[PDB]
Amino acid sequence: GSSGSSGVIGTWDCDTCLVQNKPEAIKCVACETPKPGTCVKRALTLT
Ligand SMILES: [Zn+2]
């Protein structure tokens, strides 16, 4: 919400290789790095 919002888009931009990966892939394809954020935001109630 405020103080920095999380990309509300689908695909996520990697940090190591900085490659474009689908929101379905749990990990990257180039560097094969595990997506950050252990907890799933979904947990909370949608708008
Ligand atoms: Zn990567």
Curated annotation (Swiss-Prot):
<protein>
    <recommendedName>
        <fullName>Nuclear pore complex protein Nup153</fullName>
    </recommendedName>
</protein>
<comment type="function">
    <text>Component of the nuclear pore complex (NPC), a complex required for the trafficking across the nuclear envelope. Functions as a scaffolding element in the nuclear phase of the NPC essential for normal nucleocytoplasmic transport of proteins and mRNAs. Involved in the quality control and retention of unspliced mRNAs in the nucleus; in association with TPR, regulates the nuclear export of unspliced mRNA species bearing constitutive transport element (CTE) in a NXF1- and KHDRBS1-independent manner. Mediates TPR anchoring to the nuclear membrane at NPC.</text>
</comment>
<feature type="binding site">
    <location>
        <position position="17"/>
    </location>
    <ligand>
        <name>Zn(2+) 2</name>
    </ligand>
</feature>
<comment type="subunit">
    <text>(Microbial infection) Interacts (via C-terminus) with HIV-1 capsid protein p24 (CA) (via N-terminus).</text>
</comment>
<comment type="subunit">
    <text>Part of the nuclear pore complex (NPC). Interacts with TPR (via coiled coil region); the interaction is direct and provides a link between the core structure and the TPR-containing nuclear basket of the nuclear pore complex (NPC). Interacts with HIKESHI. Interacts with SENP2. Interacts with XPO5. Interacts with RAN; the interaction occurs in a GTP- and GDP-independent manner. Interacts with MCM3AP isoform GANP; this interaction is required for GANP localization at the nuclear pore complex. Interacts with MAPK1.</text>
</comment>
<feature type="binding site">
    <location>
        <position position="28"/>
    </location>
    <ligand>
        <name>Zn(2+) 2</name>
    </ligand>
</feature>
<feature type="binding site">
    <location>
        <position position="31"/>
    </location>
    <ligand>
        <name>Zn(2+) 2</name>
    </ligand>
</feature>
<comment type="function">
    <text>(Microbial infection) Interacts with HIV-1 caspid protein P24 and thereby promotes the integration of the virus in the nucleus of non-dividing cells (in vitro).</text>
</comment>
<feature type="zinc finger region" description="RanBP2-type 2">
    <location>
        <begin position="8"/>
        <end position="37"/>
    </location>
</feature>
<feature type="binding site">
    <location>
        <position position="14"/>
    </location>
    <ligand>
        <name>Zn(2+) 2</name>
    </ligand>
</feature>
<comment type="similarity">
    <text>Belongs to the NUP153 family.</text>
</comment>
